[PDB]
Amino acid sequence: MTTLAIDIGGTKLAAALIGADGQIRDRRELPTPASQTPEALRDALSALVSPLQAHAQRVAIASTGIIRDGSLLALNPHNLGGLLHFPLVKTLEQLTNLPTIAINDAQAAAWAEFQALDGDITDMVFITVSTGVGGGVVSGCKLLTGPGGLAGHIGHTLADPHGPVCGCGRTGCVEAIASGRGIAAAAQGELAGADAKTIFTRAGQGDEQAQQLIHRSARTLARLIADIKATTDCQCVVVGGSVGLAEGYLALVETYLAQEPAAFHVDLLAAHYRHDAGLLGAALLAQGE
Amino acid sequence: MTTLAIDIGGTKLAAALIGADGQIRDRRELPTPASQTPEALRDALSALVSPLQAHAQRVAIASTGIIRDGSLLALNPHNLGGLLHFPLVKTLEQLTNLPTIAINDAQAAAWAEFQALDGDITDMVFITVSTGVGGGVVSGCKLLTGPGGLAGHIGHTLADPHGPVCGCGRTGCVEAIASGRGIAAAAQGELAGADAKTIFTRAGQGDEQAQQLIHRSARTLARLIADIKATTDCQCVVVGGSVGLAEGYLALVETYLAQEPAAFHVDLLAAHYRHDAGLLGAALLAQGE
Ligand SMILES: [Zn+2]
Ligand SMILES: [Zn+2]
């Protein structure tokens, strides 16, 4: 059995063929349509999966946003345009005639990271810090998606009631402070307008402000991890994404978490997959269907 | 078959016989020993359950603090004295010769509250606000205890990084602001020294400081509920405890939650059980054993 694995992001629509061995084969890519209409996405998904769909027996989609009742939702619904409640699972099922599942991309990535761990771990939380902050919760070897697909949206838990307004509408989410976008938005002076990448580079050269923006991110993430430990009693936390995997970042988080009381401590690990974890995690979930 | 349900708290040790009908029968009570030695707790438990133990098939203990490997832990290990790592399950097993389970009291209460709900809810979070703040998470009709018995400790998640220091050692926990002890601790002027009950009365009479202390607690709890919704995707939140059940309190929490973006909204319900939910929950959890 081969899974047609799809990753639906904001900028790119990716698809691959993944068999039982978990290898990524025939990796295809298309840009995400600028026009956010249901017709345009159905066109782009059909075009993306055509040359692959005869070689697969089931479809699995990792999507940015929220999947509820097989349909596309977001924390800021206005960002989807005409794609709000787009029937994502039904669309593929019509286009391919193949059984289809859809999950949030950070939930998909979480499952992949969990399966990459040793067999003794039953409870794990995954956090990705990139442009945004996403998460996924595994409890008793089961991925928690939630009845509405929201579970693990830990980037949108509170970091500071007097912090910046987040894109979701809340004041002071973890994401508004700790993400690459929040790091960049807090930048003043000669750092104003620089992206997270540049800021990490400047911090590497001993730029004090750049360093503090990153310390603030890592401190925010450490407190989140303490929160999640208190809530879920996870046995380890896997940290990924372009910010999360940036050199020295995990060490910073670990150092700040160590300052919390011993009961809130949890083992931290670097993400095993740098790329394509959503694609992989989606295919792995489709194997248990 | 009948469960010898036990509730171990800071002040009082309670025990009852509870059959399949859920009727609390032959309820007894004893004060918790001031000398926190294992010998004194063993004696006080032995005395409490000796008239009941010949009429039960199993023991179930709802306990304050943390239950890890059948032993007593807390978020402040110094607060247990010689009772840190007290082999709670083992003690009962030796005293009664009955199969014994132990669980956190708020986790116990959560399970009872979940069962008293209608059949459609699969995902529920329980929050109790009294002297402290405790919780329990039910996901997919299963109570999440956590591998170390921690899960659902939502009173000790972050409310404000510049908030008051909590008894667990963290700065700015929900509990340190929103709980009855949190409300009493922030009272200034003539209000200083008044308990949460007095503060609640004076608030209803138009005392602006007292009202601010309760508004602050209600607002803090709303933000916690928004966090928990983001993390668990719970379908409803049941709120209990002397503070949580206080007149007007839940409606105020509900008002504050409604100011958050729509995705963070979740139905709030008053606790079905005002007393003895721990005993009931423990016996209910013992039934599925
Ligand atoms: Zn947010
Ligand atoms: Zn605390």
Side-chain angles (χ1 to χ4, degrees):
Chain A
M1 291 163 194
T2 304
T3 305
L4 172 52
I6 304 162
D7 194 293
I8 292 173
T11 59
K12 58 179 75 188
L13 305 173
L17 290 170
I18 301 171
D21 66 328
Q23 217 218 0
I24 295 160
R25 297 181 183 168
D26 316 337
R27 204 191 177 277
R28 280 177 46 87
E29 211 168 67
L30 272 182
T32 306
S35 67
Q36 300 186 122
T37 72
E39 289 83 16
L41 189 65
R42 190 191 178 99
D43 290 0
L45 288 170
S46 165
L48 182 69
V49 311
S50 29
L52 303 173
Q53 70 188 77
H55 305 117
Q57 292 80 38
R58 52 198 176 193
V59 180
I61 305 157
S63 182
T64 194
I66 297 158
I67 303 301
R68 180 190 177 258
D69 303 324
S71 304
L72 188 47
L73 275 71
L75 281 183
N76 189 12
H78 313 287
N79 290 341
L80 283 179
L83 296 176
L84 184 74
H85 309 295
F86 179 80
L88 195 61
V89 166
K90 195 200 74 191
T91 295
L92 285 203
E93 277 174 340
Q94 284 167 344
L95 285 174
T96 68
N97 214 256
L98 301 172
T100 307
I101 59 162
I103 21 83
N104 163 265
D105 69 325
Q107 289 178 3
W111 191 243
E113 294 291 339
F114 176 73
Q115 295 288 122
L117 297 180
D118 295 45
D120 53 316
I121 305 302
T122 54
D123 292 62
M124 179 222 65
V125 170
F126 168 73
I127 306 171
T128 176
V129 195
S130 210
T131 65
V133 182
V137 181
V138 177
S139 280
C141 309
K142 288 190 170 190
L143 169 71
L144 187 73
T145 66
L150 183 66
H153 271 80
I154 43 83
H156 303 277
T157 58
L158 180 73
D160 193 345
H162 304 102
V165 181
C166 183
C168 79
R170 279 188 85 187
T171 309
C173 291
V174 168
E175 193 175 80
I177 301 168
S179 70
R181 217 220 277 270
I183 288 165
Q188 293 178 318
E190 64 204 319
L191 248 25
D195 59 25
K197 184 99 168 191
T198 301
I199 293 155
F200 267 89
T201 302
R202 302 290 182 94
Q205 338 272 205
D207 178 309
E208 152 111 55
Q209 194 206 152
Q211 282 178 1
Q212 287 311 293
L213 295 179
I214 293 166
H215 284 227
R216 188 159 139 271
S217 171
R219 169 73 74 179
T220 297
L221 212 75
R223 299 194 182 117
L224 169 61
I225 292 173
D227 293 350
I228 291 173
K229 182 53 180 179
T231 300
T232 68
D233 199 14
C234 49
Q235 290 160 308
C236 64
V237 171
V238 183
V239 179
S242 59
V243 171
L245 293 168
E247 279 184 39
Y249 185 81
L250 186 58
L252 232 48
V253 174
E254 189 161 296
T255 299
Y256 294 141
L257 181 59
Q259 298 180 0
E260 306 293 345
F264 298 95
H265 294 188
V266 64
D267 291 324
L268 301 185
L269 299 168
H272 178 73
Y273 305 101
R274 191 179 286 274
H275 309 294
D276 297 319
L279 277 181
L280 287 159
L284 288 159
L285 281 164
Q287 292 172 20
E289 293 294 307
Chain B
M1 49 278 289
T2 301
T3 304
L4 170 52
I6 305 176
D7 192 295
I8 292 177
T11 56
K12 52 175 72 175
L13 310 174
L17 296 165
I18 303 174
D21 65 338
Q23 292 299 120
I24 302 156
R25 319 188 255 98
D26 305 343
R27 198 191 185 273
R28 306 217 331 150
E29 214 170 68
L30 276 182
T32 303
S35 66
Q36 299 180 114
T37 74
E39 288 98 342
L41 190 66
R42 191 184 181 96
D43 298 354
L45 286 174
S46 173
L48 177 67
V49 308
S50 46
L52 304 166
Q53 70 189 59
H55 308 104
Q57 289 67 55
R58 58 205 167 190
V59 175
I61 317 160
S63 177
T64 195
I66 301 168
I67 305 298
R68 184 190 172 270
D69 305 324
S71 303
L72 186 60
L73 276 71
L75 285 176
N76 193 353
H78 307 289
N79 289 352
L80 284 173
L83 291 184
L84 189 66
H85 300 289
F86 181 79
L88 196 55
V89 160
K90 198 189 77 179
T91 301
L92 263 140
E93 280 172 344
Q94 289 174 359
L95 290 172
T96 70
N97 211 299
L98 302 183
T100 301
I101 64 153
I103 35 169
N104 166 79
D105 67 324
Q107 286 178 354
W111 189 246
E113 294 290 341
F114 180 72
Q115 290 292 101
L117 292 177
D118 294 53
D120 55 321
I121 302 304
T122 61
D123 293 69
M124 184 225 56
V125 167
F126 172 76
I127 309 187
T128 175
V129 194
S130 20
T131 60
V133 176
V137 182
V138 175
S139 290
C141 312
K142 284 179 175 182
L143 174 70
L144 182 75
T145 66
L150 186 55
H153 268 77
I154 46 180
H156 301 274
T157 65
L158 183 69
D160 191 350
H162 319 298
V165 189
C166 180
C168 75
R170 289 188 77 178
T171 294
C173 288
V174 170
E175 188 178 80
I177 291 161
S179 74
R181 272 156 66 109
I183 294 161
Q188 298 182 283
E190 75 245 310
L191 202 53
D195 59 34
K197 192 164 185 164
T198 307
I199 291 155
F200 261 95
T201 306
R202 299 196 187 175
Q205 302 170 342
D207 183 326
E208 156 76 358
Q209 198 205 154
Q211 286 185 12
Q212 284 308 302
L213 298 178
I214 291 154
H215 274 262
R216 176 169 158 269
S217 160
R219 165 75 77 173
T220 300
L221 206 77
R223 293 197 194 108
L224 171 60
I225 289 162
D227 289 353
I228 294 168
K229 181 55 172 174
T231 299
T232 68
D233 202 16
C234 51
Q235 282 157 321
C236 64
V237 179
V238 183
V239 178
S242 59
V243 174
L245 292 174
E247 207 161 292
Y249 185 78
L250 188 59
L252 198 54
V253 170
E254 202 180 71
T255 302
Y256 287 133
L257 180 58
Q259 292 169 9
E260 308 289 351
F264 301 94
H265 300 169
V266 61
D267 294 322
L268 311 183
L269 312 151
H272 183 84
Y273 304 105
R274 186 176 286 270
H275 304 291
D276 292 332
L279 293 164
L280 290 159
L284 280 165
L285 282 157
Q287 290 175 35
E289 215 76 28

